[PDB]
């Protein structure tokens, strides 16, 4: 329809892993920001370089909607100027980021009794990510001097790990669905 498809991003049945975060390009549509941004207190909502109460008045070239899942203690990393394994190796925002970050506890959707090992994050990388860079490579990381030749072993680790989201975990280990809206689509 005429409205911007923010429904297909926030309400998607499955979210992407943070190391392979999805991006949705949103252009040439009308958005009801104030209505869809009027979130309840159980939402983590932080905006940068722009006020939420002014988005219904501005127009932008494009609005990128990035979505992924991390654990609760890593939500603070989804912000400009942050460091850590998620901000450096998985999803890096620029220092002059203009947009909003939305997060909510999704323990009832992404955690499994036997463990939801489906969500992954990158643990090792030779250098940090550039802003908005996506690295889905899983080549055997060489932490030493001997070449790995794609073979696992000593000083040669698989660069990815799993979250294994279980409902019995504490909030710091519970899954959180994250949507990052980048502004550079008129609000109405």
């Amino acid at each position, epitope marked *: 329809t005429n409205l911007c498809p923010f429904d297909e991003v926030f309400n998607a049945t499955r979210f992407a892993s943070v190391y392979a975060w999805n991006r949705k390009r949103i252009s040439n549509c009308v958005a009801d920001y*104030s209505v869809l*941004y*009027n979130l309840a*207190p159980f939402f983590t*909502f*932080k*905006c*940068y*370089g*722009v*006020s*939420p*109460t*002014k988005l219904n008045d*501005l127009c932008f070239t494009n609005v990128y909607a990035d979505s992924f899942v991390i654990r609760g203690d890593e939500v603070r990393q989804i*912000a*400009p*100027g*942050q460091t850590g394994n998620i901000a450096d190796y998985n999803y890096k925002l620029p*220092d*002059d980021f203009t947009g909003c970050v939305i997060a909510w506890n999704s323990n009832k959707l992404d955690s499994k009794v036997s463990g939801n090992y489906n969500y992954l994050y990158r643990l090792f990388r030779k250098s940090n990510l550039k802003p908005f860079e996506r690295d889905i490579s899983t080549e055997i990381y060489q932490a030493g001097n001997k070449p790995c030749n794609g073979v696992a072993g000593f000083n040669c680790y698989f660069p990815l790990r799993s979250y294994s989201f279980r409902p019995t975990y504490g909030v710091g280990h519970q899954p959180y669905r994250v949507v990052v809206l980048s502004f550079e689509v008129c609000g109405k």
Partner: antibody
Amino acid sequence: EVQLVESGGGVVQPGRSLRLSCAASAFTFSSYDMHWVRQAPGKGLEWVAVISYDGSNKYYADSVKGRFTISRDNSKNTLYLQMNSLRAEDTAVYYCAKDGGKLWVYYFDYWGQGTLVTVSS
Amino acid sequence: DIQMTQSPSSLSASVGDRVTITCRASQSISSYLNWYQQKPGKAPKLLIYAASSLQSGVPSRFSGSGSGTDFTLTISSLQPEDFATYYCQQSYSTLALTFGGGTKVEIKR
């Protein structure tokens, strides 16, 4: 020229509730975002909450989220702050501040003289 | 939250002196830095917004500069009514607005 006058402050027991008000004058109140900022005795300034010009969007600092509630009546040019479940750490002078509106971000260009809120048993 | 660190915490000066305050941000806040003046028993007053823009009605002896993480407020010639505490406040993180600890400009004797 902008005029902001707070009222409703006083003493309150822990866990109770208190409501503040802020009557505005000499500017188009219905086209500017309004803020609440508190300041503990002898401490610095801490932003509390903001409400959109029309009163449809509200956002709070984490220290008061799910605890305070902000509202406005554009027919009376009055701002409100409903403070429920008041802790001792909430004891401060509460200012209402007008947003300058000249930037993409928030900033306080005029402050009221504030009202004291003492939370003790 | 973004931490704003002011230095010095306090400085002594006399009428006619040039005063320079520093405000540092824990991360790049672009140019959304605001300076406020507060006297004892009074509400704050906006001096500079957006790092360098002088608020209407403020004397031109006040000025600000800097971008990114290092910012500066300068009083070209200190007047008797400028002895106060000065706060910087970042507005880059719009839903997590934070102030600096403040800087007290006292009378030197």
